[PDB]
Amino acid sequence: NDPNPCPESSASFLSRITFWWITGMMVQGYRQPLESTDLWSLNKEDTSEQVVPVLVKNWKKECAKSPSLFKVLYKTFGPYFLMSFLFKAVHDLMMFAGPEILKLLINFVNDKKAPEWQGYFYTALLFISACLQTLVLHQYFHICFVSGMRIKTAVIGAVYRKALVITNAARKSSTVGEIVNLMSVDAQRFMDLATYINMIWSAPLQVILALYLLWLNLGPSVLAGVAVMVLMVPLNAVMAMKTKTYQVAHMKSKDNRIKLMNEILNGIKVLKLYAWELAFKDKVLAIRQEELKVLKKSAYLAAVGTFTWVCTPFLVALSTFAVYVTVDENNILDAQKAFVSLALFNILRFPLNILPMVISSIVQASVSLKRLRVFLSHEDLDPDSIQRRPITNSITVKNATFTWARNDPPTLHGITFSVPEGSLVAVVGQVGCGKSSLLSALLAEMDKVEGHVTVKGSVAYVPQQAWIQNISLRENILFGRQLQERYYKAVVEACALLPDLEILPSGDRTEIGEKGVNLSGGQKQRVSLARAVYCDSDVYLLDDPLSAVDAHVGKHIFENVIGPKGLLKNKTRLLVTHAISYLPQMDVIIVMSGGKISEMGSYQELLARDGAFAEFLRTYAETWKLVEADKAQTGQVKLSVYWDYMKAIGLFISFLSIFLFLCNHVASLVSNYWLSLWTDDPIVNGTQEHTQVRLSVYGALGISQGITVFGYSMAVSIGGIFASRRLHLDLLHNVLRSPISFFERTPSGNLVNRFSKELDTVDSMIPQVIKMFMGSLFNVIGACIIILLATPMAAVIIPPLGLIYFFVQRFYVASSRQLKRLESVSRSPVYSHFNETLLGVSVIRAFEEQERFIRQSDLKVDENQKAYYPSIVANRWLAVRLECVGNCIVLFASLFAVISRHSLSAGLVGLSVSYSLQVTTYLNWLVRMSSEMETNIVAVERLKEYSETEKEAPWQIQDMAPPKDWPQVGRVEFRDYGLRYREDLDLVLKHINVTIDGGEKVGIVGRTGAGKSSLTLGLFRIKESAEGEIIIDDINIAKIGLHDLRFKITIIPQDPVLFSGSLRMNLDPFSQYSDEEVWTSLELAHLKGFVSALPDKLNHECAEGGENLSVGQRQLVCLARALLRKTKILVLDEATAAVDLETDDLIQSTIRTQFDDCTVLTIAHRLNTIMDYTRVIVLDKGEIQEWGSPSDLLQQRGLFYSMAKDSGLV
Ligand SMILES: Nc1ncnc2c1ncn2[C@@H]1O[C@H](COP(=O)(O)OP(=O)(O)OP(=O)(O)O)[C@@H](O)[C@H]1O
Ligand SMILES: CC(C)CCC[C@@H](C)[C@H]1CC[C@H]2[C@@H]3CC=C4C[C@@H](O)CC[C@]4(C)[C@H]3CC[C@]12C
Ligand SMILES: CC(C)CCC[C@@H](C)[C@H]1CC[C@H]2[C@@H]3CC=C4C[C@@H](O)CC[C@]4(C)[C@H]3CC[C@]12C
Ligand SMILES: CC(C)CCC[C@@H](C)[C@H]1CC[C@H]2[C@@H]3CC=C4C[C@@H](O)CC[C@]4(C)[C@H]3CC[C@]12C
Ligand SMILES: Nc1ncnc2c1ncn2[C@@H]1O[C@H](COP(=O)(O)OP(=O)(O)O)[C@@H](O)[C@H]1O
Ligand SMILES: [Mg+2]
Ligand SMILES: [Mg+2]
């Protein structure tokens, strides 16, 4: 029992054949524009739940049986798609039958004596044949399009189901670029094959059936015609083989582009802060140029392919007629037969003119078939590698050796330990020694070479990089679980989240943002912890959850949650710690260096050892929503869009294209009438050579027609490339120029959609639609001009026939357009969900929530399909209506000719029928193509949207540009400075007033969520000042072009962000300076040893956004990045967060030596590294509290004293 079910199920037989059931929606759509709400629920068999499981099953049955073939696996959609063959057969015989009846009528009308009754019968038999072919043809087309739709669901369903199981090593090879490409473009390639796959036999049948009529007419002279056509195949064959290589290279360039764009949109804040977006712009363009260069070559071959097929029947015709006179000198010599022979030849263009699109589709689909087959055949991480015994030690690892990649050398070298039930274990060691690795090994994320691993009970995971969903804070803490009011409140207060829940705008239920961009580092880490704690599992793997928060909250969380008095007192919990404060509280602590456990034991036991760790210890010891969903445009498409696409093509090509179209269709009409005038001439003994004279002229025009067709097919293709190139550059510049607030609002999939699918539409579709539209347009003008001039008194018939076609076209398109918008809008969540999942697969797999996320994906794809399905039915609805109107007019033209056979104008009236069918079929084509054009241009409308938006301040002002040596003394002055993140939200900073003098070392201290990171975000002018101003050395900041600002001051941001490419590229993407400078920087960064010992020294492939190396190494890469610029104002935003105590001591000593003369302000939680500084700023919520020298603030016994006492400096 559905609330709004599809009417197709309940529809009677008469309704189903004519598609009468969609009538109701089409009328509703005309009155007021269609909404997402009044779309019908899908049919049970059109649903991911019913479609995808049978495909993945067949893959399990077929892949397990084996190489693994994907083509044999596409017998899943075979059964349903066979009926299509039967429907296509009947239609072709009815197409063949049509002309026969028309000959008998055109003959009947001529013969005066013929009985009254026999005339009507022919017209009645014509009308019925036209109706039957229409109904049968559109049953065929509906089966083809429904098949295509079901293949789209399954391809997306399978790819998502696979993405959650694939190995890490395979995840590096199959990048996010390929996965997004597979779900988007390759599914559209299979959908487009679904139509034309049925022509592979329908064209040869039609070619044979037309050829046999010539044998019946001519005889054994039709062989030459077959000999010419068979010789043709090899050319199209080798050219198709050549294209197959171009399509592969084109797709590879498209994957690389989408992969790079993903890495840009991930870390856009870092691009904005370092002022790097021009470097990454140039890189995206370089990849686009390669992709477009190949697409041009593919288009050149298509033109040669089209050129070959269009001029085949004329070359066949001349080849055939030569055979007669070169042997048959005895019997045959006819004059009129030529006309019937040419009338039989001129049908052999209708099959051959649709062939190069069949070839293009099959090649394009065959590439996509290989790419999907290669992706679904990747090695799957096996969960039976770990024992996972039912709820005697908690976890046991015995001589286990794990490796990130199968062929690479192992990370963990023969580790051996056992942890008892309800034991608090700690993991310690150097930066990049394999701690996060050890936790990954127990989750079966890493491949193991040898050993034995047993993990008894359910596992809960807290990763080092916090992963938060787009949904409300409560729903993040729940993570798809039933709510317990007692326990929920008990977890939230234990995780120290109450003050954070107070400061948030709408308290608990706030739209948290796409990657938790709203929250601060500590808030993200606390939510991530709270989720895992709420889940209530047997074993707890905590990857440094007390890093980002200060000493106060850290202690609170340790006493209330993790420690032996908290919630998790009884559960086995293995935490990775860098702090040495809580090691006496631990049961056993495991030290590891270079992937080997150096020594295990308790605090006292390890102290008694007098080892390396002992020596280490001595030295240091109604709710407000944020994300706005995509919303469809309401009215008609504005001429601005069309004019913008045409402006990109250029004036020269547009005047050439139209000119060649005219030359083509003029030659078409000259040939048309020159033949029809040649027809009605007597066969006298004279005009013996005239036939051999004029058939050369017919051949010449046939070649001329072919040459021009090749011409305009080329002209439109190059036009399309110019447009597609220009549109991408405008889109990319518009995106890179927008402010940070826009990116925090707009969903990720919202942009991925426009950069992948909407651009792929602009690249491929629109040129083909333009070619077919212009073709149909000039065909209609060409028919109209002929009938009018042949019968000047037929000027009355044209308007009425046009007006009724126009009103059907204007009615239909109004709804058709809106359905294409709804579909195009509703596909954005599908990308967002894919993007959200791929980041947090480790977490999803740890909590075993796969089924829920898989089930969520199915429900998100259903919405896209619910929007798509009415669109294709509406196409069928229109087509049947227009053809049935066409049949009616043909009947009246046909019936009028029989009624008034001999009354008057007997010679003229007989022909009236002949072109009454022509004009009908051409006006039928014009409406359908004009609609297809209006629905396709929506893609360009969608790309334009980010032109009329909010833009960031001008990059280069070039008038008020400050001197080359502007930051000469780092004198930073804040004057009544106040920041506000949104327009409606309350102020984060207010009435800030400090004077940081030149070369002054300034600390910034405060409680988590005090406005520390926001102050540094404010200085770079990422968010524009609400009140007051900042001044850097007697020069106002708001005035200057922010690229003159941003190059002169450096920051180490809180989150370390690396981009996909060589390790050298991350340090310097402009390629400005030498390798000696990079090496001396990596020497000061303390990565020299690590980066030197690597297989490729500085050409190491950092992939997936720097997942190839550890968090603490990304910290040092971001340090090196800052060390290379060597500016006079430096800003540290917790640069020493996820590192050792030893490693921290080093990079501090670096900062003291290198940045000795330049102004440095540092934000920090480790107060150890502040007490050395000259002055310190302390701020609580939005205002600066007591500030001065650290020694002074300790004497005062105020706030800074309280924070020092927690750290244990006092
Ligand atoms: N997914 C991965 N693919 C390939 N190599 C990896 C991967 N993860 C880690 N490594 C390599 O293993 C080394 C150390 O592993 P790991 O990241 O577990 O260190 P860690 O102890 O977590 O360090 P940190 O203290 O920075 O958290 C790194 O130097 C890195 O090159
Ligand atoms: C005689 C005519 C009318 C019918 C035969 C012509 C067509 C259907 C034939 C001739 C050459 C053939 C192509 C030759 C090469 C390729 C590339 C391959 O990777 C996929 C199949 C594909 C694309 C073939 C499909 C069928 C094909 C296009
Ligand atoms: C170089 C050549 C091919 C460029 C040709 C550009 C042509 C095809 C463009 C420019 C303006 C466009 C038209 C603008 C207005 C409408 C009305 C709409 O209800 C149907 C589409 C239709 C009829 C468009 C069809 C495509 C169009 C005619
Ligand atoms: C109609 C008959 C008489 C003449 C036909 C000549 C045709 C085939 C010629 C004349 C001018 C030519 C065009 C001139 C300019 C360009 C731009 C170039 O970057 C790609 C090829 C392209 C698009 C050419 C394609 C072929 C072309 C259209
Ligand atoms: N992009 C944002 N949009 C709206 N509010 C934000 C944003 N970033 C941070 N906030 C809010 O401002 C407060 C202070 O943030 P911030 O100064 O960045 O944290 P911290 O001082 O801990 O580094 C936080 O409690 C947070 O809720
Ligand atoms: Mg780690
Ligand atoms: Mg911060």
Author numbering: 203 to 268, 311 to 635, 641 to 870, 942 to 1530
What does the publication say?
Multidrug resistance protein 1 (MRP1) is an ATP-binding cassette (ABC) transporter that harnesses the energy of ATP to extrude substrates from the cytosol to the extracellular space. Native substrates of MRP1 include a variety of antioxidants, pro-inflammatory molecules, and hormones. MRP1 is a single polypeptide comprising three transmembrane domains (TMD0, TMD1, and TMD2) and two cytosolic nucleotide-binding domains (NBD1 and NBD2).
Guided by the smFRET results, we then used cryo-EM to capture the most abundant structural configuration of wild-type (WT) MRP1 during active turnover. To prepare the sample for cryo-EM, WT bMRP1 (30 µM) was incubated with 80 µM LTC4 and 10 mM ATP-Mg2+ on ice for 10 min before plunge freezing in liquid ethane. On ice, we expect a slower turnover rate and thus even less depletion of ATP. This approximates an ‘active turnover’ condition where ATP hydrolysis has reached steady state. We first used all 1,143,729 particles from the cryo-EM dataset to calculate a 3.4 Å reconstruction that represents the dominant structure under the active turnover condition. To improve the resolution of the structure, we also carried out 3D classification and obtained a higher quality map at 3.2 Å from a subset of the particles, which unambiguously shows an ADP molecule at the consensus site. In both structures, the intracellular gate is closed and the substrate-binding site is pulled apart such that LTC4 is no longer bound. Thus, for MRP1, ATP hydrolysis per se and the subsequent release of inorganic phosphate (Pi) do not induce conformational rearrangements.
